[PDB]
Write a protein that binds this ligand. Structure first.
Ligand SMILES: CCCCCCCCCCCCC/C=C/[C@H](O)[C@H](N)CO
Ligand SMILES: CCCCCCCCCCCCC/C=C/[C@H](O)[C@H](N)CO
Lengths: 57, 245, 242, 282, 94, 242, 57, 49, 49, 48
């Protein structure tokens, strides 16, 4: 059982980690999470713009 | 009665009465590119009759001291017909081939030709003779067109590899006492699903007389060799203006 | 103890090796995280954002570099002229260097997927016109006239209340991935050439200016990926920092 | 549908862990059944066996076919490079081309296409084989990345490039390298030109050069700012793992001359066989 | 002008085929982009009395500085490696 | 930590050792494989393919080496003459060096199994004849006459519409495997001698040539195996490549 | 759990592999698969040739 | 990696030690054994003669 | 630094210190140092009988 | 090489001494009037 002291408690994937110490920040990086939300940088508008409609009618 | 054969594709037909089997290279028939192997997203064109038909090239003359000939594919057809126009207007091409080599003589002639398909036939030079020059073959040698070129050192196939184990490739023989034709069906072989038709040659066809031609004086001394080829599942993609080379 | 043998690779330091190292502070616990807006999980979220393409990258523009962000469009006397021409290679030196997609491509070796270029017209309300924006697959140089350039992928853009159009550059390649194009053997990996032509004239009434400007923006599509992460060649360090 | 014409492999694999058994057979006299007469013109190999040509006994043999599998044929470390630091400013940039040594080159060129993972081992010493306490750095530079110009260049910061720090008195370093071609396999033979354009005689060097096999630059240095008084000799060895191979080729019977072309010495063509005097006397 | 990126795709601008592609998005994740050891400091003992006090500032080398300054905020654990030798690269028992 | 002891074999580099080494690229994924025809999984698939045997390996043939691939057959005056004679050793220097079986045998130390030699007649349709192709087990030299040579394994070949015959060389050995035969103590591993004789004459009418040629092809059977993979002796490197 | 990134996903045999890392190309070679299809190099003809029948009748 | 400590007896070669060493030939298979008369399993079979 | 190579019968044996046979592309070879522990390998039964 | 771009057949001499070239109906109109020098060369069939 470890001290739960890691920089990130998320996006490291379920399990897939290796540690030999009681501190959780000493562990390896593991394989990364492949979640992504691109629409908060590309379409951050209040009224949603449909692809086929004219965007300024 | 399997010595007779008929190959019909497009608006063309080849009949033969003195034949061996048909060789299907590596046990695979030509196919169109499936969705799992494709990478380019635009829709390809498949003309299906105007390009998938038999094409007859120029005719060689088998003499008593001939070394051998080679052709490059699909370089032989880049200026011929509707296939040659689709290969110039498009950037990518993909197709298989059906090669047919004809050579007839009488029952008093003798000789044997080896007809082989060698993929990625890269040519070498004699390196200036002494081995000190880093020479390279010219453009008329590496891509000779529909005419073809002559082999200079057929024992090493002009590439440093022996003729004696060329039969590890898909091949047939034309033995003059037995048959007068050879037929190989070649699929598309590359590391990529599509490629350029003007920059890359998939395979080379080699026709080499292993046993030389012989006859007595008074018989016909003009023994010609004709090559007839057909694309099978020709696809083209990447449409742009016509580029010849 | 337990019998062991040491293998090659012993006492080496590989900088990309992922392992377990000894912690310096036993029982330490960090500051708890709070919610911050704008978290990034993948670099492909940044690559889909449109940034300005520097199509007007001229040698006479280097002392007034704000003019490199827009290229002019004017009233023509002859028909079918070309306005601009540039390559579609995002990792090559040229107009794509000023984009965040062309900057994050430099940290990787190979790329794949479709691109997009958006052109925004910044003239008057009273100005009209039609342009032809073509993408040519590899095989040649810039097309000589308009009737040669329209044989490839193109879009005809009409100026109006919607001030923007999108030319999608589709993935048309022989290999599954493309390395970055370069003069030499690596011109095997070239993407092609984007040209813009006059379909009709730039028409204007009395009282409105006869020259306008177009801003080009570029991003990536949702089938875009990169691989083989490497060092970039844009930053350097000859002198010591501070 | 108003238009009716718009409506529209030979062999398989088997696991053979041992060689084939021989069945017992007796004599055979008759007409019509001739298994010894063949036709080599069809392009097919002969299908005649032991039991149809002679009288055989029963042999149950358990000779394994494991060693001739291409994974066992290729998983052996062979020399691919020798790099020397006498190149007098303490660094070498080596362009990666593994076709410079004839033993591994002839094994790989049996096939046309190959797809594998690799394992590289770096055996370093002095030019006479002695070892000294000396720190070195190996860096892999992918194509497009900046390559180092001196011993104290900024490119040795290796913030994204993979790098190995090692000592000469250490054991040899080992790394695993994946399959990193933009195509689906490496090809040792590429019949064509990489780019478009005219193909004149001054650009004939371009023939046969595939950019799908060009993997970049391997850089070495001595780490410190000052000049090291030791000469370096680095030998690189490569194992081939997880291999797939396509399209066998004739094996080369001529000695190699250059690294990028199949050029051969034309004044001395070697015969594949050893000659004798008469065809009747061995 | 809306501040939004373009939402036009391949299938709405040209005629496309079906492509089932399996290109992975694992390498561009920011864990794989950052988990590479880069140089942050060079400390020398020619400082002639046998000790150095170095104030920790990791923004002195341009390659790791430009990678980290792509973002405004960052929260991570670190792993530090100390490669020590003589100024010419030789090693002594010390 | 855990108590351990280091054993002999520590810090050695064995080139045939199979182990786990550290990867250089975390998160890398390769290009997906496509279907390519002609995949090889085992080297015994290549060994069963017939390739040309250089029975006519004479010292006068070295400047015209295309004549080494066929040996002549002609009209005889006396009866029972021999046409050719060669050893059945695939790994020895001689006619078997030009085959892909005799080349892949050189990468291994020991072999086992049956062989096959196919002779193809390349004369006229009007030519007739009968040949005796014999295989002799070890114990002697080339047989002096035809009545000595037929006491071993043989086949009588009649020329006709089928232009080929197969002489199977069966596995007749004392050991389970054979090393490669050589002058000295390793003549213990010899296979024997293949000779071809005239059974009747080569008969021909007026107007057809009196000399024809035979091509010999050689492969392996389905009980063929090899073992103890080693370096070949055919390629060398005295001068540096490039 | 590993990144599935190996040069060959076939002919390595069921299991029989050793790895200590999250990348699949770092693993050992293991023992090879003994599958073989010799008939696509030896008998690649359209009409199959029986052993006892005359092959050109 | 895993924390370990080296004990006395490290890097010694004891000639009667029985352990595992690295093989030189991957995938090698020997010649199959045949039946030979007169097999010995223990030296006490010879001592009773 | 030393190199031990096993040359099976039929394989080319080295003629000098810089011979091509030391490339060991198929021959099993061990690279070792003199200050190392002694090298150990396992050798199978490799007779033709 | 110009003539083989149309409909053709390759005939090998042998034990079957005959071959058939089929001339297929390739026309714009459903029926053809008889071809003649003048305006009625509109109805020509082609060249063997
Ligand atoms: C610190 C790690 C350094 C090791 C980097 C090694 C990466 C290079 C691996 C390349 C794998 C073989 C690619 C092709 C090699 C041949 O030179 C080409 N076929 C040339 O014909
Ligand atoms: C014996 C252990 C010695 C190692 C101690 C290392 C502790 C320091 C870790 C700091 C982590 C990065 C903190 C910020 C670094 C940059 O210099 C600041 N952003 C300055 O702008």
């Amino acid at each position: 059982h470890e001290n739960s002291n890691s920089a990130s408690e998320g996006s490291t994937i379920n399990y897939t980690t290796i540690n030999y110490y009681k501190d959780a920040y000493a562990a390896s990086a593991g394989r990364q999470d492949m979640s992504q939300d691109p629409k908060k940088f590309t379409d951050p508008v209040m009224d949603v713009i449909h692809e086929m409609a004219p965007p300024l009618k | 009665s399997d010595r007779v054969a008929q190959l019909t594709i497009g608006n063309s037909t080849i009949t033969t009465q003195e034949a061996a089997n048909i060789v299907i290279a590596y046990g695979e028939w030509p196919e169109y590119c499936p969705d799992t192997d494709a990478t380019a997203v635009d829709k390809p064109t498949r003309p299906d009759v105007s390009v998938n038909r038999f094409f007859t090239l120029d005719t060689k003359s088998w003499a008593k001291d001939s070394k051998g000939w080679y052709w490059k594919f699909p370089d032989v057809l880049t200026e011929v017909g509707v296939f040659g126009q689709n290969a110039q207007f498009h950037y990518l091409y993909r197709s298989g081939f059906c090669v047919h080599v004809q050579c007839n003589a009488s029952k008093f002639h003798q000789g044997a030709l080896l007809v082989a398909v060698l993929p990625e036939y890269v040519l070498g030079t004699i390196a200036g003779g002494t081995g000190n020059e880093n020479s390279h073959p010219p453009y008329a040698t590496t891509q000779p067109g529909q005419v073809g070129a002559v082999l200079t050192h057929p024992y090493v196939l002009d590439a440093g590899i022996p003729l004696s184990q060329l039969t590890v490739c898909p091949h047939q023989w034309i033995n003059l006492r037995t048959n007068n034709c050879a037929t190989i069906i070649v699929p598309y072989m590359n590391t990529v699903p599509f490629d350029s038709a003007l920059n890359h040659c998939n395979f080379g066809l080699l026709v080499i007389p292993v046993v030389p031609l012989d006859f007595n004086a008074g018989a016909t001394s003009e023994i010609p060799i004709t090559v007839t080829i057909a694309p099978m599942c020709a696809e083209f993609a990447g449409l742009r203006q016509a580029v010849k080379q | 103890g337990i019998p062991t043998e040491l293998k090659p690779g012993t006492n080496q330091f590989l900088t990309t090796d992922d392992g377990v190292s000894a912690p310096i502070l036993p029982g330490f616990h960090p500051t708890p995280p709070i919610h911050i807006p704008g978290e990034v999980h993948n670099l492909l979220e940044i690559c889909r954002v449109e940034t300005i393409l520097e199509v007007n990258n001229l040698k006479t523009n280097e002392t007034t570099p704000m003019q490199r962000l827009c290229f002019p469009v004017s009233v023509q006397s002859k028909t079918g002229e070309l306005c601009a021409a540039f390559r579609a290679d995002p990792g090559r030196d040229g107009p794509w260097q000023s984009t965040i997609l062309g900057q994050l491509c430099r940290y990787y070796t190979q790329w794949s997927g479709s691109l997009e270029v958006t052109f925004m017209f910044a003239g008057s309300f009273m100005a009209t016109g039609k342009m032809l924006i073509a993408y040519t697959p590899p095989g040649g140089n810039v097309p000589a006239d308009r009737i040669t350039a329209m044989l490839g992928t193109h879009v005809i853009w009409d100026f109006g209340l919607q001030s923007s159009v999108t030319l999608v550059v589709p993935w048309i390649s022989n290999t599954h991935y493309r390395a970055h194009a370069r003069a030499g053997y690596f011109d095997y990996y070239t993407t092609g050439i984007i040209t813009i032509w006059y379909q009709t004239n730039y028409v204007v009434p009395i009282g409105a200016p006869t020259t306008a400007y177009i801003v080009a923006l570029a991003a990536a599509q949702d089938n875009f990926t990169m691989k083989l992460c490497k060092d970039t060649e844009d930053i350097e360090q000859t002198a010591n920092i501070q | 549908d108003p238009i009716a014409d718009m409506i529209d492999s030979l062999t398989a694999l088997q696991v053979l862990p041992t060689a084939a058994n021989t069945e017992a057979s007796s004599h055979r006299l008759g007409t019509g059944v001739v298994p010894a007469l063949q036709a080599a013109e069809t392009g097919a190999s002969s299908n005649a066996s032991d039991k149809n040509l002679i009288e055989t006994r029963c042999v149950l043999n358990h000779h394994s076919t494991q060693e001739t599998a291409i994974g066992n044929f290729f998983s052996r470390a062979g020399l691919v490079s020798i790099i020397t630091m006498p190149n007098t400013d303490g660094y070498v940039n080596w362009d990666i081309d593994l076709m410079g040594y004839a033993q591994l080159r002839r094994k790989c060129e049996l096939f046309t296409y190959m797809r594998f993972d690799a394992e590289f081992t770096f055996v370093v010493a002095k030019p006479n084989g002695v070892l000294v306490p000396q720190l070195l750095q190996y860096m892999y530079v992918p194509p497009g990345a900046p390559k180092p110009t001196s011993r104290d260049s900024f490119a040795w910061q290796t913030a994204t490039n993979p790098s190995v720090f090692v000592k000469m008195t250490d054991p040899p370093a080992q790394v695993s390298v994946p399959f990193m071609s933009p195509a689906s396999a490496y090809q040792w033979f590429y019949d064509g030109y990489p780019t478009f354009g005219e193909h004149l005689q001054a650009n004939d060097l371009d023939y046969g050069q595939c950019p799908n096999n060009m993997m970049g630059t391997f850089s070495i240095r001595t780490v410190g700012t000052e000049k090291s008084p030791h000469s370096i000799t680095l030998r690189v060895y490569m194992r081939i793992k997880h291999v797939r191979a396509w399209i066998p080729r004739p094996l080369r019977n001529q000695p190699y001359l250059f690294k990028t072309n199949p050029n051969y010495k034309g004044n001395d063509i070697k015969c594949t066989s050893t000659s004798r005097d008469k065809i009747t006397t061995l």
